[PDB]
């Protein structure tokens, strides 16, 4: 054992309170940089000219935001997709005005989070586990890539990336509806199905295992004290929960293989969230939601509005008001 | 920013009162 090997063993040690890992050797610095830049910027960054029209948007607390309205504001549209590291600016004052912190944070963050995924694989290998938790995390990771990288690439600017704020996130959702009619896109409908049903099945599983917990405590103590960490036996009667739940609907609508039951819980929301991340990724290239505007017309040819035309009226309200000083020509093509 | 004066006292007690409850309950659990 020499210097390199002692280090290699520390890095991949399964005795560290927090696993490090080769993926962690990248994740730790990139996440730290992003987290420190994000916190300073959120509190103190001065206004950022997000839309490139010399009209700065104040995102930080010290400049009169609160927790809900504050943000790290995306980098200037004048920058488009150009790389804007600190060293490319003439002064930090220039880097701040033009929104450099958003580039630094998102790049370090996306790098950091891709290696988090990798680190989940890595530790599972050292622990003797099956490897695929990192596959589940890939649904939220891709989702984040979609709003922070892909959608900017398709539209040619990080100025149309998702802002790092609570209200900025809403701005981003609203403008998206106007430009892509995302509600009418099947992949986002799959993501709603992803998350409603993931919440639905999460209550169902909690409610059902909780229902069939085996008495092991008295009325005064928490029932939680009837499980002991590491115990070999199960704390609940799955036969009984299948018996409740098979009758609630019918016998075959109900799982009786615990393995089949948990793979279903993993698979449902992960798939759904893959699809909505893909929906954001593809609407990045302007393949938008179904367009049924004026799809119904009468014998003479008058337009017979459906609910889709009513959506489109709201969409148009979003369209004409958003970024109200930034368009000189009549189509908003990116 | 012209914010609410009572907002500070409402926020502070909102944190302080329920937190102290939990702290009282936890420390006397430990000492028995």
């Amino acid at each position: 054992a020499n210097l390199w090997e002692r280090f290699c063993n520390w890095v991949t040690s399964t005795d560290n309170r927090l696993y490090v890992g080769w993926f962690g050797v990248i994740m730790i610095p990139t996440l730290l940089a992003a987290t420190i830049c994000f916190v300073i910027a959120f509190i103190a960054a001065p206004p950022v000219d997000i839309d490139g029209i010399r009209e700065p948007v104040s995102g930080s607390l010290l400049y009169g935001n609160n927790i809900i309205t504050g943000a790290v504001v995306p980098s200037s549209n004048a920058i488009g997709l150009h790389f804007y590291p600190i060293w490319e600016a003439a002064s930090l004052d220039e880097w701040l005005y033009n929104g450099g912190p958003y580039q630094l944070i998102i790049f370090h963050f996306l790098l950091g989070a891709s290696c988090y995924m990798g680190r989940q694989w890595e530790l599972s290998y050292r622990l003797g586990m099956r490897p695929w938790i990192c596959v589940a995390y890939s649904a939220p990771l891709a989702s984040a890539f979609a709003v922070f990288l892909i959608y900017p690439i398709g539209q040619g600017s990080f100025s149309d990336g998702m802002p790092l704020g609570i209200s900025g996130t809403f701005n981003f959702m609203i403008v998206f509806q106007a430009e892509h009619n995302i509600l009418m896109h099947p992949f986002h409908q799959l993501g709603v199905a992803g998350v409603f049903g993931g919440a639905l099945f999460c209550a169902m599983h909690g409610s059902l295992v909780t229902s069939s917990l085996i008495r092991e405590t008295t009325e005064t103590e928490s029932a939680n004290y009837g499980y002991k960490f590491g115990q070999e036996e199960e704390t609940y009667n799955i036969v009984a929960a299948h018996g409740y739940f098979g009758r609630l609907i019918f016998q075959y609508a109900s799982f009786n293989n615990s393995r089949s039951l948990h793979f279903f819980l993993a698979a449902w929301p992960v798939v759904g969230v893959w699809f909505t991340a893909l929906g954001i990724s593809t609407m990045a290239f302007n393949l938008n939601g179904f367009n049924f505007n004026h799809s119904v017309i009468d014998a003479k040819g008058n337009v017979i509005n459906t609910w889709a035309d009513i959506i489109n009226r709201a969409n148009l309200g979003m369209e004409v008001m958003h970024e109200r000083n930034a368009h000189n020509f009549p189509l908003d093509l990116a | 920013m012209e914010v609410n004066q009572l907002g500070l006292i409402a926020t502070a007690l909102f944190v302080l009162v329920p937190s102290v409850f939990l702290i009282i309950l936890y420390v006397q659990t430990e000492s028995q």
Binding site: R17, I43, L61, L62, N66, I67, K228, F229, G230, Q231 | M1, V3, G7, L8, T11, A12, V15
Partner: peptide, 30 residues
Amino acid sequence: METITYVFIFACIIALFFFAIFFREPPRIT
């Protein structure tokens, strides 16, 4: 004053992270 309040509460949560991880109840194999 409201800036200070937002940041104080943020900072309290970060300290809570530190203790919840490093001064957790250790899980024991009983």
